[PDB]
Write a protein that binds this ligand. Structure first.
Ligand SMILES: NC[C@@H]1O[C@H](O[C@H]2[C@@H](O)[C@H](O[C@@H]3[C@@H](O)[C@H](N)C[C@H](N)[C@H]3O[C@H]3O[C@H](CO)[C@@H](O)[C@H](O)[C@H]3N)O[C@@H]2CO)[C@H](N)[C@@H](O)[C@@H]1O
Ligand SMILES: NC[C@@H]1O[C@H](O[C@H]2[C@@H](O)[C@H](O[C@@H]3[C@@H](O)[C@H](N)C[C@H](N)[C@H]3O[C@H]3O[C@H](CO)[C@@H](O)[C@H](O)[C@H]3N)O[C@@H]2CO)[C@H](N)[C@@H](O)[C@@H]1O
Ligand SMILES: [K+]
Ligand SMILES: [K+]
Ligand SMILES: [K+]
Ligand SMILES: [K+]
Ligand SMILES: [K+]
Ligand SMILES: [K+]
Ligand SMILES: [Mg+2]
Ligand SMILES: [Mg+2]
Ligand SMILES: [Mg+2]
Ligand SMILES: [Mg+2]
Ligand SMILES: [Mg+2]
Ligand SMILES: [Mg+2]
Ligand SMILES: [Mg+2]
Ligand SMILES: [Mg+2]
Ligand SMILES: [Mg+2]
Ligand SMILES: [Mg+2]
Ligand SMILES: [Mg+2]
Ligand SMILES: [Mg+2]
Ligand SMILES: [Mg+2]
Ligand SMILES: [Mg+2]
Ligand SMILES: [Mg+2]
Ligand SMILES: [Mg+2]
Ligand SMILES: [Mg+2]
Ligand SMILES: [Mg+2]
Ligand SMILES: [Mg+2]
Ligand SMILES: [Mg+2]
Ligand SMILES: [Mg+2]
Ligand SMILES: [Mg+2]
Ligand SMILES: [Mg+2]
Ligand SMILES: [Mg+2]
Ligand SMILES: [Mg+2]
Ligand SMILES: [Mg+2]
Ligand SMILES: [Mg+2]
Ligand SMILES: [Mg+2]
Ligand SMILES: [Mg+2]
Ligand SMILES: [Mg+2]
Ligand SMILES: [Mg+2]
Ligand SMILES: [Mg+2]
Ligand SMILES: [Mg+2]
Ligand SMILES: [Mg+2]
Ligand SMILES: [Mg+2]
Ligand SMILES: [Mg+2]
Ligand SMILES: [Mg+2]
Ligand SMILES: [Mg+2]
Ligand SMILES: [Mg+2]
Ligand SMILES: [Mg+2]
Ligand SMILES: [Mg+2]
Ligand SMILES: [Mg+2]
Ligand SMILES: [Mg+2]
Ligand SMILES: [Mg+2]
Ligand SMILES: [Mg+2]
Ligand SMILES: [Mg+2]
Ligand SMILES: [Mg+2]
Ligand SMILES: [Mg+2]
Ligand SMILES: [Mg+2]
Ligand SMILES: [Mg+2]
Ligand SMILES: [Mg+2]
Ligand SMILES: [Mg+2]
Lengths: 73, 101, 119, 88
RNA sequence: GUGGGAGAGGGUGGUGGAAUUCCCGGAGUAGCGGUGAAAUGCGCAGAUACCGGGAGGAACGCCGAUGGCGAAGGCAGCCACCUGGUCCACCCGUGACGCUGAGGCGCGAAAGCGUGGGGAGCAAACCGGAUUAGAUACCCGGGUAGUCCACGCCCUAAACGAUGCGCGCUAGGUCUCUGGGUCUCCUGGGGGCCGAAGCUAACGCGUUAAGCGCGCCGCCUGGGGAGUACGGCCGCAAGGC
């Protein structure tokens, strides 16, 4: 049910469409490189849909990972 | 005439001279395709999330411009020619969409 | 004869066979084992026990190169994955960490009919 | 695309009087502009059909408006045709 | 018309990372693979497992949904250009200019055809290994057309909501996408669920009607024979109407 933390409420005022800001977007990415679901991000449909394309943009620029390796387990 | 943003990522290992030459070519080509420069941000070297051209870091340039749309694509071509330039991404500028306001 | 003493442990596991490769930190391998290296021949290679024997044999082979600490790398979803893990966990080898690297395509290639109803 | 200035140019051009945005003449004019632009777009890109549907719909609307004009005031009809250069 | 919005709607170019296969180099040893169990197969010309570099083709993981767009077929990495549809607010403009629509014209998944190209993975036919009483199959190892691109044909479907299009009227509750507003909420467009009256043979439908009505088109008239025969039209052929 993801009762731990909501990523939006864990953050302040920020721009979603901005692809150059890593120290925020990184918080929206999981332990692996995957984009977090609506349950975790606590965004809305519109918001999440924009964040998606911006994250992908950041990935292409080399700022954000496409994928990562899972630690522990 | 539309307002764009030019992201350019090039070789972090460049000495000030070669780098200056690269930016010179960028400015030159920009003038050639008639792009007025509204502002600029030089972010320098930064750590990439994945290796690009075998190199773990990269040097970033950002240009907010205004240029005729018809040649934008045709512009990108030129910018991609330089071997020292490993990334080119041109975006139509957008009004910032704020969250949690 | 190298005397590495610190290295990587790659576990490749499938429903069919489990196979362990121990390498130096550069990734170049030293020794290796598998359910086939041990006397097991047929389906028994896909066993947890086969996996245990495999990882332990690889460990013992790698003690002869005088190695102590390893990083474990896990690939594939298969029986005897966690058992090979536990095998290395105390073989006497110090396990520095465990990481699952299992390759997942971004959907490049059409799978065999066996693996389909997916992409 | 079609910028505001062009649109205001053709509107102010065909308007029956000052302030008229909605006249049959104005409509037929705008539609003719859009149609010509689209056809010039479909000389290249002739594999794009979904737009060609749009072209068919516009052509249809124009033909209907022109038909209406033809019924009401044949003078204004012939005038519109002459200034636009339709019907071939 | 003016001003705003959302969208995998379409076309062209460029581009990004993961994975598979192949090639080169390093290291490394006796098997890998695959199944219910096996064998064919690959491996001492060094395979499998691992690291580094390179080539090529195809598809876009998470976001992603009971979501969105499109007339239908259908559409999903990212960027730019060209381009269609559509919704809301303002009451600004014309003044019945509307609806449907035989024939016509265009679009039309997959397979299939022609010419040229491409060919990584998968894979009809086909070559083999198993199973079986047999196994012209299911399972396993290979593999050609094809799947991919361009141009031109083909016109089919469980082309499905098995529900033609447009307009009006007839309780609400709830979830959701997307606008606007006095932003508890009101108002509008789209997608779901339960249900008033009512309808239905029943199942079920129920402001997204299968209810109450009007307009126009298409179609049905017991089952097999049969979507066959003949004729005509279309098609390079397969074959379609
Ligand atoms: N069209 C492709 C997409 O366009 C998006 O942007 C599209 C929409 O956001 C934008 O909407 C425009 C805008 O002017 C405003 N919101 C209202 C306007 N009526 C719309 O224009 C619309 O109608 C006209 C015909 O009149 C069409 O030519 C056009 O395609 C359509 N968008 O028009 C753009 C082009 O259609 C994004 N770039 C991206 O999703 C993608 O490239
Ligand atoms: N490649 C981008 C796309 O290309 C489409 O068409 C393009 C491709 O379908 C076609 O083939 C190209 C070509 O470079 C050459 N034949 C090989 C190349 N790998 C292909 O390009 C593409 O191939 C496939 C899709 O088919 C993609 O999976 C791949 O990422 C991409 N490189 O070439 C066309 C252009 O030369 C459309 N323009 C549009 O969908 C989009 O721009
Ligand atoms: K053998
Ligand atoms: K849906
Ligand atoms: K609102
Ligand atoms: K009943
Ligand atoms: K039901
Ligand atoms: K037909
Ligand atoms: Mg370059
Ligand atoms: Mg086995
Ligand atoms: Mg209409
Ligand atoms: Mg699109
Ligand atoms: Mg080799
Ligand atoms: Mg083989
Ligand atoms: Mg082979
Ligand atoms: Mg042999
Ligand atoms: Mg030998
Ligand atoms: Mg290999
Ligand atoms: Mg490699
Ligand atoms: Mg090749
Ligand atoms: Mg999904
Ligand atoms: Mg729909
Ligand atoms: Mg009025
Ligand atoms: Mg009046
Ligand atoms: Mg009609
Ligand atoms: Mg017809
Ligand atoms: Mg077809
Ligand atoms: Mg086909
Ligand atoms: Mg062909
Ligand atoms: Mg051919
Ligand atoms: Mg195969
Ligand atoms: Mg096969
Ligand atoms: Mg056989
Ligand atoms: Mg039998
Ligand atoms: Mg052939
Ligand atoms: Mg036909
Ligand atoms: Mg259906
Ligand atoms: Mg329904
Ligand atoms: Mg529907
Ligand atoms: Mg209906
Ligand atoms: Mg009809
Ligand atoms: Mg229908
Ligand atoms: Mg209509
Ligand atoms: Mg309607
Ligand atoms: Mg509604
Ligand atoms: Mg739908
Ligand atoms: Mg009900
Ligand atoms: Mg009742
Ligand atoms: Mg009942
Ligand atoms: Mg419908
Ligand atoms: Mg009705
Ligand atoms: Mg019939
Ligand atoms: Mg019939
Ligand atoms: Mg009869
Ligand atoms: Mg019959
Ligand atoms: Mg038939
Ligand atoms: Mg005949
Ligand atoms: Mg003939
Ligand atoms: Mg035949
Ligand atoms: Mg036949």
């Amino acid at each position: 049910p993801s009762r731990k933390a909501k990523v939006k409420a864990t953050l302040g005022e920020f721009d979603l469409r901005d692809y150059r800001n890593v120290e925020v977007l990184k918080r929206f990415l999981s332990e692996t490189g995957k984009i977090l679901p609506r349950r975790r991000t606590g965004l809305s449909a519109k918001e999440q849909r924009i964040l998606a394309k911006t994250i992908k943009r950041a990935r292409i620029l080399g700022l954000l990972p496409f994928t990562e390796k899972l630690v522990r387990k | 005439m539309r307002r764009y943003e030019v992201n350019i990522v090039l070789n972090p290992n460049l000495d000030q001279s070669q780098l200056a030459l690269e930016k010179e070519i960028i400015q030159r080509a920009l003038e050639n395709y008639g792009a007025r420069v509204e502002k600029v941000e030089e972010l320098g070297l930064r750590r990439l999330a994945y290796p690009i051209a075998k190199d773990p870091q990269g040097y970033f340039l950002w240009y907010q411009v205004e240029m005729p749309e018809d040649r934008v694509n045709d512009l990108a071509r030129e910018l991609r020619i330089r071997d020292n330039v490993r990334r080119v991404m041109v975006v139509k500028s957008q009004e910032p969409f704020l969250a949690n306001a | 004869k190298r005397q590495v003493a610190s290295g990587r442990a790659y576990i490749h596991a499938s429903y069919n066979n489990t196979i362990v490769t121990i390498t130096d930190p550069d990734g170049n391998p030293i020794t290796w084992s598998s359910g086939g290296v041990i006397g097991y021949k047929g389906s028994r290679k896909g066993t947890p026990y086969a996996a245990q024997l495999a990882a332990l044999d690889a460990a013992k082979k790698a003690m002869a190169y005088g190695m102590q600490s390893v990083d474990v790398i896990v690939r594939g979803t298969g029986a005897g994955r966690e058992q090979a893990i536990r095998a290395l966990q105390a073989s006497g080898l110090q396990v520095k960490s465990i990481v699952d690297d299992t390759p997942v395509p971004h959907n490049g290639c059409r799978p065999k009919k066996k693996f389909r109803k997916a992409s | 695309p079609i910028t505001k200035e062009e649109k205001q140019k053709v509107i102010q051009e065909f308007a029956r009087f000052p302030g008229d945005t909605g006249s049959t003449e104005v409509q037929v004019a705008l539609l003719t502009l859009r149609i010509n632009r689209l056809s010039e777009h479909l000389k290249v890109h002739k594999k794009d059909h979904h737009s060609h549907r749009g072209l068919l719909m516009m052509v249809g609307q124009r033909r209907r408006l022109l038909r209406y004009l033809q019924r009401e005031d044949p003078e204004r009809y012939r005038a519109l045709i002459e200034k636009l250069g339709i019907r071939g």
